[PDB]
């Protein structure tokens, strides 16, 4: 679950890349950048309640 302000999103990780940029002289990293992609999850009992499907 991902929350920030107005945002609220549920799902799964699909992809990630991490790149290491700066280092201390003994090889300890102090800066890195990450790119992320998230998919969306709906449980099947909640899908039929949101699609309130109504001659029947």
């Amino acid at each position: 679950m991902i929350t920030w302000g107005s945002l609220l999103f549920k799902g799964y990780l699909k992809e990630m890349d991490i790149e290491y940029k700066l280092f201390r002289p003994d090889g300890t990293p102090i800066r890195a950048m990450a790119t992320t992609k998230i998919g969306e999850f709906v449980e099947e009992e909640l899908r039929t309640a949101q699609e309130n499907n109504q001659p029947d």
């Binding site: 700066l22 280092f23 201390r24 002289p25 003994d26 090889g27």
Partner: protein, 145 residues
Amino acid sequence: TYYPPSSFHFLVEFTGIDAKNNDHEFQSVSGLSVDIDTEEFAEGGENRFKHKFPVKTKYPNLVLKRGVLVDSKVISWCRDAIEDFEFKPIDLTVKLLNEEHQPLMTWNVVHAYPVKWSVEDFNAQESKMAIESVELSYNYFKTIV
């Protein structure tokens, strides 16, 4: 030196072109310098500086100026290259002279050929001398001193 020399007394000589005294006299000479191209590299963990490496030695063109001379041998040589693509490189010597008119120091210019020739604009309202300019490409130079 203790008293360094001045720069207004010098001689330009050509090898491979018939000599005439009027082709050894010039108003100005420029381009006797050199530089080294480099590349940079950042090594992870080293934050005090980047590394620099040499790649190539580089030389600028040699530029000569003088008042216009109509029967020059150097210009005939320039024209063969300019008009017909006939190229025949020459060697050249630049001499910086002392008070006995002997060399203090010389420059040996190797395998030169013409890339440019021009004459400055005419102006009916100004009192001026017609000035000619010649530029040469070469491979490298050495010094003797």
